[PDB]
mmCIF file with all atom_site columns, C-alpha atoms in Angstrom:
data_model
loop_
_atom_site.group_PDB
_atom_site.id
_atom_site.type_symbol
_atom_site.label_atom_id
_atom_site.label_alt_id
_atom_site.label_comp_id
_atom_site.label_asym_id
_atom_site.label_entity_id
_atom_site.label_seq_id
_atom_site.pdbx_PDB_ins_code
_atom_site.Cartn_x
_atom_site.Cartn_y
_atom_site.Cartn_z
_atom_site.occupancy
_atom_site.B_iso_or_equiv
_atom_site.pdbx_formal_charge
_atom_site.auth_seq_id
_atom_site.auth_comp_id
_atom_site.auth_asym_id
_atom_site.auth_atom_id
_atom_site.pdbx_PDB_model_num
ATOM 1  C CA . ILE D 1 1  ? -6.649  -3.225 3.982   1.00 25.29 ? 88  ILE D CA 1
ATOM 2  C CA . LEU D 1 2  ? -3.028  -3.478 2.864   1.00 22.88 ? 89  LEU D CA 1
ATOM 3  C CA . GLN D 1 3  ? -4.122  -5.225 -0.323  1.00 22.85 ? 90  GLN D CA 1
ATOM 4  C CA . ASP D 1 4  ? -6.874  -2.714 -1.073  1.00 21.90 ? 91  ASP D CA 1
ATOM 5  C CA . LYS D 1 5  ? -4.267  0.027  -0.751  1.00 22.78 ? 92  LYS D CA 1
ATOM 6  C CA . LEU D 1 6  ? -1.945  -1.962 -3.018  1.00 22.62 ? 93  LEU D CA 1
ATOM 7  C CA . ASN D 1 7  ? -4.660  -2.361 -5.639  1.00 21.55 ? 94  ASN D CA 1
ATOM 8  C CA . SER D 1 8  ? -5.629  1.309  -5.518  1.00 20.21 ? 95  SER D CA 1
ATOM 9  C CA . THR D 1 9  ? -1.966  2.147  -6.091  1.00 20.23 ? 96  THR D CA 1
ATOM 10 C CA . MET D 1 10 ? -1.869  -0.318 -8.988  1.00 20.29 ? 97  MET D CA 1
ATOM 11 C CA . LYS D 1 11 ? -4.974  1.297  -10.478 1.00 21.12 ? 98  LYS D CA 1
ATOM 12 C CA . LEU D 1 12 ? -3.361  4.728  -10.201 1.00 19.79 ? 99  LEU D CA 1
ATOM 13 C CA . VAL D 1 13 ? -0.249  3.368  -11.908 1.00 19.60 ? 100 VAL D CA 1
ATOM 14 C CA . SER D 1 14 ? -2.359  1.908  -14.713 1.00 21.88 ? 101 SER D CA 1
ATOM 15 C CA . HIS D 1 15 ? -4.142  5.240  -15.131 1.00 15.58 ? 102 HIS D CA 1
ATOM 16 C CA . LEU D 1 16 ? -0.789  7.016  -15.370 1.00 14.59 ? 103 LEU D CA 1
ATOM 17 C CA . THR D 1 17 ? 0.356   4.478  -17.965 1.00 14.90 ? 104 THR D CA 1
ATOM 18 C CA . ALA D 1 18 ? -2.803  4.981  -20.017 1.00 16.32 ? 105 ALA D CA 1
ATOM 19 C CA . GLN D 1 19 ? -2.532  8.772  -19.898 1.00 17.47 ? 106 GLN D CA 1
ATOM 20 C CA . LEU D 1 20 ? 1.122   8.574  -20.937 1.00 20.79 ? 107 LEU D CA 1
ATOM 21 C CA . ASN D 1 21 ? 0.121   6.354  -23.858 1.00 21.94 ? 108 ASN D CA 1
ATOM 22 C CA . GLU D 1 22 ? -2.596  8.831  -24.832 1.00 21.15 ? 109 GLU D CA 1
ATOM 23 C CA . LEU D 1 23 ? -0.027  11.632 -24.797 1.00 20.19 ? 110 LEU D CA 1
ATOM 24 C CA . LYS D 1 24 ? 2.227   9.464  -26.962 1.00 17.58 ? 111 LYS D CA 1
ATOM 25 C CA . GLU D 1 25 ? -0.574  8.987  -29.499 1.00 17.68 ? 112 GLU D CA 1
ATOM 26 C CA . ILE E 1 1  ? 5.701   5.806  10.004  1.00 17.67 ? 54  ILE E CA 1
ATOM 27 C CA . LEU E 1 2  ? 4.752   3.144  7.466   1.00 16.82 ? 55  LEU E CA 1
ATOM 28 C CA . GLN E 1 3  ? 1.215   4.515  7.332   1.00 16.09 ? 56  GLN E CA 1
ATOM 29 C CA . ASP E 1 4  ? 2.343   8.126  6.970   1.00 17.22 ? 57  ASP E CA 1
ATOM 30 C CA . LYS E 1 5  ? 4.475   7.019  4.030   1.00 18.17 ? 58  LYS E CA 1
ATOM 31 C CA . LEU E 1 6  ? 1.488   5.127  2.620   1.00 19.26 ? 59  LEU E CA 1
ATOM 32 C CA . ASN E 1 7  ? -0.735  8.187  2.921   1.00 18.25 ? 60  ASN E CA 1
ATOM 33 C CA . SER E 1 8  ? 1.839   10.491 1.344   1.00 15.56 ? 61  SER E CA 1
ATOM 34 C CA . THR E 1 9  ? 2.032   8.049  -1.563  1.00 14.13 ? 62  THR E CA 1
ATOM 35 C CA . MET E 1 10 ? -1.766  8.026  -1.779  1.00 12.97 ? 63  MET E CA 1
ATOM 36 C CA . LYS E 1 11 ? -1.795  11.830 -1.823  1.00 13.06 ? 64  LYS E CA 1
ATOM 37 C CA . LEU E 1 12 ? 0.762   11.848 -4.636  1.00 8.39  ? 65  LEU E CA 1
ATOM 38 C CA . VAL E 1 13 ? -1.378  9.360  -6.555  1.00 7.58  ? 66  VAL E CA 1
ATOM 39 C CA . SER E 1 14 ? -4.452  11.543 -6.068  1.00 9.03  ? 67  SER E CA 1
ATOM 40 C CA . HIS E 1 15 ? -2.511  14.578 -7.285  1.00 5.13  ? 68  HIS E CA 1
ATOM 41 C CA . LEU E 1 16 ? -1.438  12.662 -10.387 1.00 7.88  ? 69  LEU E CA 1
ATOM 42 C CA . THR E 1 17 ? -5.052  11.631 -10.985 1.00 6.25  ? 70  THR E CA 1
ATOM 43 C CA . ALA E 1 18 ? -6.250  15.222 -10.651 1.00 3.74  ? 71  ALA E CA 1
ATOM 44 C CA . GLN E 1 19 ? -3.580  16.557 -13.006 1.00 4.99  ? 72  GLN E CA 1
ATOM 45 C CA . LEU E 1 20 ? -4.433  13.862 -15.550 1.00 4.34  ? 73  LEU E CA 1
ATOM 46 C CA . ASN E 1 21 ? -8.095  14.855 -15.303 1.00 5.91  ? 74  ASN E CA 1
ATOM 47 C CA . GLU E 1 22 ? -7.156  18.507 -15.792 1.00 7.12  ? 75  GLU E CA 1
ATOM 48 C CA . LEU E 1 23 ? -5.193  17.565 -18.908 1.00 7.74  ? 76  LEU E CA 1
ATOM 49 C CA . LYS E 1 24 ? -8.228  15.615 -20.114 1.00 8.73  ? 77  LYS E CA 1
ATOM 50 C CA . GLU E 1 25 ? -10.444 18.681 -19.671 1.00 9.05  ? 78  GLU E CA 1
#
């Protein structure tokens, strides 16, 4: 359960990174 | 306390996701 939460957080972080990159472009 | 912090972080992540989706739209 801890690791599923960790990986959901990582996915959210990746989504934020991708949206920031899209804004950059 | 750890789990309340976890859930606040999850809520913040969900808010970021929703705002990113709104920007997409």
